[PDB]
Amino acid sequence: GPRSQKQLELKVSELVQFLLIKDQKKIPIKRADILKHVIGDYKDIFPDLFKRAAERLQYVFGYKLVELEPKSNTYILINTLEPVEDAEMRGDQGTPTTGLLMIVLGLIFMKGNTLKETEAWDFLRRPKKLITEDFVRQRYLEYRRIPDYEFQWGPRTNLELSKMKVLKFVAKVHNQDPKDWPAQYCEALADEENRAR
Amino acid sequence: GVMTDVHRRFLQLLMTHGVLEEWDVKRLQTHCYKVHNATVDKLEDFINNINSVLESLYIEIKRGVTEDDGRPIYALVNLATTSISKMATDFAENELDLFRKALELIIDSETGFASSTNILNLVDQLKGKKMRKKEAEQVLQKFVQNKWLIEKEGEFTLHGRAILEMEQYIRETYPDAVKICNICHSLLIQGQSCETCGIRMHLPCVAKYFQSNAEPRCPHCNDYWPHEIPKVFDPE
Ligand SMILES: [Zn+2]
Ligand SMILES: [Zn+2]
């Protein structure tokens, strides 16, 4: 019937939302799913709605709507922005160790700024003895045996890292935010604010 | 409207996250600017600029205040009313109905909270694919993860993002069960109520209305306010 400009704009808005909420799980999107779950009876003007959705998905959100395979009627949003930041694994990565280090540094912060060598060893391989030996020589850790091997962060870490960034790490390790762990978080604020003066 | 790449990356990350506290979007704004190095405009000007570009899509970056302590939050919100589709697209049919059942319990609740045991009893009622309590316990935590629900003491309430997203839907669907604040006239899930009359207030609203007042009185019946007066939210 008589569809206004707003009706059409609300229509392409449903379409761009549909593609966004779906793509975030790498779906990929099917035309049949599109025609069924958002288009409806606006199928008579579908190619125009689709095109307007594509440019709005591009100009506003910076995604390129691409048919991943020719003649497949299936689409994918491709990020047309700057590469960095879910980014660089598909290309550029830091030394594996730095990853290993981050867990150990994180694991220490988790247990309460302290941990015994044998525990983390049961964690690690799942050169655990050698890497955690020169990490102390690099002053990334501390290898004290004073009342076992008792672990702490050592001097270097504080200059290259903060407990908040570690907390940002342990959050992103499997999804979370620091806030989830206010036990850990609360002292990070006492550190983040302390980093000022 | 004038739309640069720092605005697009801002919108991209504002959707990966469900909702952000004001200090975290200012952190996000500066973040996007440092990956493209000009003057960082005021957060208000930055947001108002984007919303004028989103007008043709009838969505906006909408400011909201939480109902527990009143901190400012920001989420990408539909101007429309049938905004149930944002979760309807993201979840399954049974997970959907589970949220609806949970929503019904939270609204009808006095505290604005519904226990897990009360929600898990409606599992057999769920439309779509058959699920069980073990699975339903996971879905509720997923709602917490995606900032649709907030859990306290084994009880669930609506996240501030949820209220921002579908306040329009909630009111039009449950007009007899919904609660509105006497001060801001907006949707109320949790809050304080007078014991003389029956009006209710958002915790941050009673905080500002009774601010610095040595004898808090209910604006409707002028009776002494029975409950504790919180202190207004200050970013420090
Ligand atoms: Zn209010
Ligand atoms: Zn009263």
Numbering used by the authors:
A (entry chain D): 78 to 162, 164 to 204, 219 to 239, 245 to 294
B (entry chain C): 9 to 44, 47 to 246
The authors write:
We have noted while examining the MAGE-G1 NSE-1 complex structure that the linker region connecting WH1 and WH2 was absent from the model and the electron density in this region was poor. As the missing residues lie close to a crystallographic 2-fold symmetry axis, the termini of the various domains are positioned such that there are two alternative ways to connect them. To investigate which of these two possibilities is correct, and in the absence of other experimental information, we have downloaded the structure factors and performed a re-refinement of the structure, testing if the data support the alternative connectivity. Our re-refined model has slightly improved refinement and geometry statistics, and we were able to correct a number of minor model building errors in the original coordinates. Electron density maps covering the connecting region, (calculated omitting contributions from residues in the linker region) show significant positive density features generally supporting the alternative connection, although we were unable to completely connect the two domains in this way with 2 residues (163 and 164) being absent from the re-refined model. Importantly for the biological interpretation of the interaction between MAGE-G1 and NSE-1 (and MAGE RING interfaces in general), the re-refined interface between NSE-1 and MAGE-G1 contains contributions from both the N and C-terminal WH domains. In the new interface the N-terminal WH domain of NSE-1 is sandwiched between the two WH domains of MAGE-G1 with additional contacts coming from residues in the linker region and the C-terminal WH domain WHB, some of which involve residues in the second WH domain of NSE-1. Analysis of the interface by the PISA software identified an additional 385 Å2 of interface area (1385 Å2 total), 11 additional hydrogen bonds and 7 additional salt bridges. Support for this interpretation comes from the fact that the in vitro protein-protein interaction data found that both the N and C terminal WH domains of MAGE-G1 were required for NSE-1 binding.
All MAGE family members contain a shared core MAGE homology domain (MHD) which is a ~ 200 amino acid long domain, which is well conserved across the entire MAGE family (individual human MHD’s share more than 40% sequence identity). The MHD domain structure consists of two highly modified winged helix WH domains WH1 and WH2 in a tandem arrangement linked by an extended β-hairpin. The biochemical basis for this activity appears to be exerted through binding to and modulating the activities of RING domain containing E3 ubiquitin ligases. Rather, each MAGE protein appears to recognize a unique region on its RING partner, suggesting that MAGE proteins are able to function as a versatile and adaptable protein interaction module.
